[PDB]
């Protein structure tokens, strides 16, 4: 079916260059990798695009200002500190904690912490804005004792399952 | 509610 | 440079921070195949109007199994909520197309339009649906889940 | 481990009782490839709007029905056209909708712009297309617009579109 | 058993029971899978945006080579003047460079500056005109709208330069 | 008066 | 609004 | 609001 040179543009999601763009917008003629590239820009377009939630920051990462926060270094605010946390919720999977929990020794105190945390999780799915408003009302060490452990688990998942 | 949260939040950490 | 571990789950927070890749034109398929796995789980999830780990190991199956059978501590208020989740795993045209199989006037086909129909009102509001599998007699709630049960087992093992 | 089937057409409601494979990352592509199927599907319905609120709109669940079921949505417009199958008019209505949902007017733009400035195609071609955006804006009111139309020219709204719809497929 | 539908592969089959092809994905090529997902992601996007509308009708007000041109094309041409383009009109398609722009990639961009560099003002103007078309096309385009003249042509000129720059590399 | 989940409700009984 | 599609609908068709 | 916007684009071209 006439393999040709995938549109750059097309890849990323819809060339825009009308006619003049002599590239291939046909995707019955696009290598696999092409096909494979553009979708995962496209799923990053589609999950954006379901969001109403809301200087140099941006090179520490949501996990840089968190650490941050914990290690009273960076001057982060608690407010910053709670909207990144919002961001780092919105990235884990309560179905994960569960299999981790799972593996838990009866009565481990790791247990109710990991409960906690998907308490979390679900509460910031259903109202980042009022999981925000909880993350401000908390006590400066439980805050980041809080933080701290939802890194650990972030951390822990992503490495090995 | 979310009071029921932070409550265990408290206990917890 | 491998793909950011952190990146194949989603997004990854590390910023400038990050020895990995984050640029899709460099990776294995294998790669992207797994990351769309993730991310489709997780566009779902979020559109969605939603001890505890002695439920969790059983899974919803294990759940509905029990409360057949009346063991395994299997409860009606949540009997109820693990059907709201089978009911979520199954779609209408499925069952159609088991319907479509079925001679005239055989009565699985009354079934299979009050399944579908509990798939779609599943849909529109898992509540109240949940409040009307909770409002039905025992007997004819544990004939509704044998059904359902049947059926997403027949969907599948083919 | 093998992937496991109910978790390649979603996710997978049997526990730690479940012998086969959950971890993508030991997965055959092609599994990978036929679950992200399964999974769009269920996206677009979440989502889909008006494949949600048709419960309260007239002709709808007759599209539902074990002899319309087989003919599809095609089948129950070609019938509604030819004047067998005995089709409401509020069907032929719904279906419409549903037939305007699967066309892209980016297509029918492509094909616009092959035809000659003489073409009475371009014509038909923009009405399609002005159907298809009014539809995904809003169906009921759509929908309610079809029904208005007088039977004869309502089957020449649907009788272009069967054909437009053809065209883009096959090639 | 048989090919893949190909009325699937584009979405879904309506053609119900008489469609001979295969609707079966367990039995369907890698490729006419990679095909189907991206043709329906196409489609669930399209579905999440807020029509600017059945504006196609209307060229019987005679502005039909906006096709062949294309976004990019309908935007450099109302820069330099040329080809007869509606303000209004070029508002509408920098709305849509804006749709098709991640404010990632202009983050990106923004660190490969040197501080206190006037791009990162810039950038930054860019980036809020991504965040603001995402929520509010309407009054985004109707903002774009009450801008000079020169101020306009500017804004979309560094845009489509932005766009131009993260594609190529 | 008449809503979906009571309709529901006798379709159920109706049919098990 | 739509009743610019209805017209137009007759007019073609 | 939008306000802010008018003003921080025209400041910057
Ligand atoms: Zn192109
Ligand atoms: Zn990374
Ligand atoms: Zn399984
Ligand atoms: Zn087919």
Same mark, same amino acid.
């Given at each position: 079916?006439?393999?040709?040179?995938?549109?750059?543009?097309?890849?990323?999601?819809?060339?825009? /260059?009308?006619?003049?763009?002599?590239?291939?917008?046909?995707?019955?003629?696009?290598?696999?990798?092409?096909?494979?590239?553009?979708?995962?820009?496209?799923?990053?377009?589609?999950?954006?695009?379901?969001?109403?939630?809301?200087?140099?920051?941006?090179?520490?990462?949501?996990?840089?200002?968190?650490?941050?926060?914990?290690?009273?270094?960076?001057?982060?605010?608690?407010?910053?500190?709670?909207?990144?946390?919002?961001?780092?919720?919105?990235?884990? /999977?309560?179905?994960?904690?569960?299999?981790?929990?799972?593996?838990?020794?009866?009565?481990?105190?790791?247990?109710?912490?990991?409960?906690?945390?998907?308490?979390?999780?679900?509460?910031?799915?259903?109202?980042?804005?009022?999981?925000?408003?909880?993350?401000?009302?908390?006590?400066?060490?439980?805050?980041?004792?809080?933080?701290? /452990?939802?890194?650990?688990?972030?951390?822990?998942?992503?490495?090995?399952? | 509610?979310?009071?029921?949260?932070?409550?265990?939040?408290?206990?917890?950490?």
């Amino acid at each position: 079916m006439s393999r040709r040179n995938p549109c750059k543009f097309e890849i990323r999601g819809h060339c825009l /260059n009308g006619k003049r763009c002599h590239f291939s917008h046909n995707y019955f003629e696009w290598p696999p990798h092409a096909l494979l590239v553009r979708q995962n820009f496209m799923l990053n377009r589609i999950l954006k695009s379901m969001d109403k939630s809301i200087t140099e920051e941006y090179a520490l990462g949501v996990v840089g200002v968190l650490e941050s926060y914990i290690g009273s270094i960076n001057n982060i605010t608690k407010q910053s500190a709670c909207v990144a946390m919002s961001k780092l919720l919105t990235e884990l /999977n309560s179905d994960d904690i569960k299999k981790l929990r799972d593996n838990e020794e009866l009565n481990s105190p790791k247990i109710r912490v990991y409960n906690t945390v998907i308490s979390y999780i679900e509460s910031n799915r259903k109202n980042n804005k009022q999981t925000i408003h909880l993350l401000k009302r908390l006590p400066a060490d439980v805050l980041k004792k809080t933080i701290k /452990n939802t890194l650990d688990i972030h951390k822990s998942i992503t490495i090995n399952n | 509610p979310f009071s029921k949260l932070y409550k265990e939040t408290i206990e917890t950490f």
